[PDB]
């Protein structure tokens, strides 16, 4: 209620309750006064020789809350207890609560930066629950809540890129500008707090199970099919047929088919017999959209890199995390030992691999003169009767994404993994209100001299997850995420002597196994 | 009730009522006695050198009502008030009402064509609401209600093409014949009327908004992704990775993908550097269906001609209306100045252009010997995680179409734009009953001499439209359909000194703008 | 209630509710301690060679709130949605609310200006709702709420000019002095707020429609009048008459007449064939009032500059805004490219142009000796049966004005446009209470050493607007305010890379069209 009273407590826990788990998480944040309290016009042309990077947009002084990663809510033990016990999970509700606001004021006088707090300065928070702003949350950007609870994170500055003109930095007449002070926002002093509740829409469970059985090997290898296959022609043009035998899965009749494919390049990790000195930009899979051509990693769902125990990965198809957060705007050439190169090997009985051709189809009509000929294709889209698996979600990866408000779409599983939401959690924007400096006269030009200041405080996020319980009559034990290190020099998913949070490997969800 | 009393009034109006608009429209029609009151066998072989044009079918004396265009219900001002204020619209109900029937009888005696009315002759009207007839309404044919209310239109003759045999004019044993006098029809004198009500099924709203934001540019250009991309290999085969920077949309990880594509040829309008003297038939995109090969304009949804401000259009992908209705069976070579060549430039942030390749995929497996190679594809079908925009509807274009009664289908947006209906508005068939001439003796052969006669009357159509209200926090003004002509020599969407209804340009729906 | 609690939230929105729109707007203000807390005697003589500029008056330490411009309440999109959809609008209620007061105290010690806040200092606010003060709000002065919500504005100092004597700086015995601490004012600490409600009186709607039809062309051009005109005399003095034909509007009988006129000088913008090197002061239209002569722009209602598509404007008749707010007291010679020269071309079917003579009247009595002669007049006042159009209101222009408390008036449309109010919104005056410095002894002279200090805070203004709905049976589309720029280098009505709010063109209201 006032300055000498706590406006909320530290809730950071998890409570497994049957087929349901709430996951609370309080973090501490810092909000810089971005742009010195003004809207700016960020724009760029073709950098790196590509006019795909040309954008037009606006950068606001508003910061925002991005709790759209799984480690922001899940400890690695509560993640381990999830992915080794349950076949699925999906979010149900959400409860965000910003509290203990305190706003300092830096006063650099003769290089003595005194930092004191003003009790009177406010903080604006609104939530965009009519979805009228550019939703920039679900795009794999930084500025998230940290994985580790005693880390203090700075809130990312809110910008958005509108329509540019002809792949330049210049706008078009459809390019918009959203003023964010034209939205009603709650003014928060140091004794006020901002609560917010949200209920997720009906989404499918994330299929956190690996297949126990190949897709083209769903018949039993004991009894044989009552269907025959064309095998050959005789010395005349008379066709000949053979019975599909029992375990001959290469030529049985299939009833279901794998998912989409676009053949990406496969690069060897580990030892590697890769091509030396490849500038890997000019040969990636691009998807040209209204002018320029864009790299689109990862490719849409229905494929996999990395078959099984092979060091060949499709690096265009994968999600490559770093081990630690990096400095912004770095041009460092990281190697294999720095990254978390993340495999989708668990879905190979259903999905086709991305560094191999998917099949072959007949190219000509045969005759007594022309022999039959086939040709391999590098990409195949949705066929009726297809079945694929969605992208695996990770502890270090995004939870949701917003479906773009277009006319139509085909089934909206995000390519980066997670939950495709039509009405996602609304984007909580926040800024410091501008406090003017010493203004002694009237002028019609607006104030450009402000008290330089930042605010800080805590935020708690309480999600709730409906879980799909495992129910299998499998006899032998399964593979599960065990803590298996040979001679650990450090405890993983735990700090070090420096005090930085050390993660080494990404953690999937498909560890339970389930027959098709 | 009788001959001296009006059997219905002229309702032609529109009543905007919140998120709902009823649009009434009365027109005056003329019904010729088609075929001289008999069923005939229309059939043809390969004309224009193509056996696709070979059909077998039947032509009835029945005429029909085709109010399946948007200008039959919408004035251009009420269309302007729709497409500049609302994000969507869909039909809800329908009410057709045929009234003031009067049937003349032409009597050419010594070249003095006296036209008098017989009070006793009837008119048959039935509606086909069990969908047992070939539904020929939603196919882009003429004979519609006019755009302009005081125009009198003639009702189109009802024919249908059944199954022919082996791309000839001869029938197969599956070819059917539907007698239309085997359906119960209401006999209408000059004092009778025919009412009919219809409620549309649950359809999606037509997305009458343009995107404010590119599909591959949905991240913000301020914070950068926590995902890395394979960039290159070193002097060994060791892979190397770089962080996806903030605004580098050409190589970020994408979550949603564009729609289908088939690469069509792009032709330059305006000035034009087109290839001179092209017979443009042999190089169009065809789709061979059970024998012959058919041109299929427009190609299915998910593409666009005409990027932005460029004079290159994909003429195979577009809807080309004329400015005025034309005489039937004309072989005139119209030019650019006659037609209404209709752009889909508003959907280019989501759809791929039809005169460019959509992307490229890896063609080989790399090694220390073989370098990586990619290959461009000209067509890509549905991939899971796709999102496209539907075809824009126009003031001069069709409202609905019937889904064919087959087994299965994929999401039934008609390629010509509009609303894919499973149970469309039933086809109102109408004919003049045959009045025999002077028959003085009995003969078992049926009567072939009739009183030559036509009927005329009014028809009113009352549709009802549920509207999706615009709700955006966009700050700057939008583009809207304004009446912008530089030195008009005539008022557009209004008559001239001749009295003919002059339209110059087609009117879309996507003028409001909305972020993905 | 206290220092650690927010005393009000940021309301800044608009809610269109049928034929009604509320427009909330919160801004942040800075209040300097004007005059160092004392009343002063501002007076001047003849500057610029004109004794019209000689005034006597008083300058107070009070600042005031001036939300009397349309952009203080309306975003340009909500202004666009108004002027393209409605035929009229007028204010109904008002709700001002000053909150989050915080008062700093600047302490310059050895050129180290430390700015800290005192929790104990107060702020006086009263509202003048008996109209006992000189109302200086509705006069086109600066110090308004900004157009753009995150701009912080400084409150203008309240002064007023009373009666001087004989066009000098000396007062007369009727010259008054209003002490503003003789009015009861609410003392506001940092935990207090000041609410205020107001209901506007019955005013006419602002006619935000252009005429679709000329005033002298209201007959139809098909049938002719039953009234004859004197055309000529014969070889004798016998009069002769002709019938007024159908479309001959130059000599039909008129029933209604245009508004007032005073011929101003017309100057060419754009290319321009203007007279070179004109000191444009000595030839303007003046209106001499009790001694001196005053320029009176704009001239009273009933005229227009700028016919249609011509570059000749009457610059004495127009409202010339700047693109950006300017520094106070500037003597800069702005050009055409800086200003927002604002046209009244939309009202030319009803109003007469200001750079042309309005008509001619007979100067002599004719005879057999003297021929008839006419003479053009340069000004014509109200004639019974007149009809004119009021001044267009703009997004950048004033909302209301106070009618002077005189005896009588003729219909009080303000010449600067807007709503003539008899009891306007009361003028919210505000000052910082004086906190004395170090006073160690008693003296009967009042304290002149104070703690130098300023206060800041937020103010929200909630107006409510009754709207006149458009209802026209016009067929063709209208002209509307579209966002039409050819190659934009910047988004208009939105910031730039500097962060300043960029407006280029003024926005009217007459875009709908309506017949007389």
Residue numbers in the entry:
A (entry chain A), B (entry chain A), C (entry chain A): 209 to 724
Task: Kindly provide excerpts from the paper associated with this entry.
Adeno-associated viruses (AAVs) belong to the Dependoparvovirus genus within the Parvoviridae family. Because of the broad differences in their tissue tropism and transduction efficiency and the absence of pathology, AAVs are the promising vehicles for therapeutic gene delivery. Adeno-associated virus receptor (AAVR), which is a glycosylated protein containing five polycystic kidney disease (PKD) repeat domains in its extracellular portion, was recently identified as a key proteinaceous receptor for multiple AAV serotypes to employ the post-attachment events of viral entry. To dissect the divergent rules of engagements between multiple AAV serotypes with AAVR, we select two AAV serotypes, AAV1 and AAV5, and solve the atomic structures of their complexes with AAVR by cryo-EM.
The density maps at atomic resolution, in particular the density at the virus–receptor interface, revealed that PKD2 binds to AAV1 and PKD1 binds to AAV5. In contrast, PKD1 contacts the outer rim of the spike on the AAV5 capsid outwards the icosahedral threefold axis, which is on the opposite side of AAVR PKD2 bound to AAV1/AAV2, and spans the canyon region towards the icosahedral fivefold axis and the twofold/fivefold wall of the capsid. The AAVR PKD1 polypeptide spanning residues from AAVRV305 to AAVRE401 was built into the density and refined. The PKD1 residues in strands F/G and the CD loop interact with the AAV5 capsomers to form a major fulcrum. However, the structures of AAV5 capsomers with and without PKD1 attached display strict structural homology with an r.m.s.d of 0.27 Å for all Cɑ atoms from 519 residues, indicating that no obvious structural shift occurs upon AAVR binding. As a control, the wild-type (wt) AAVR bound to AAV5 with a KD value of 0.287 μM.
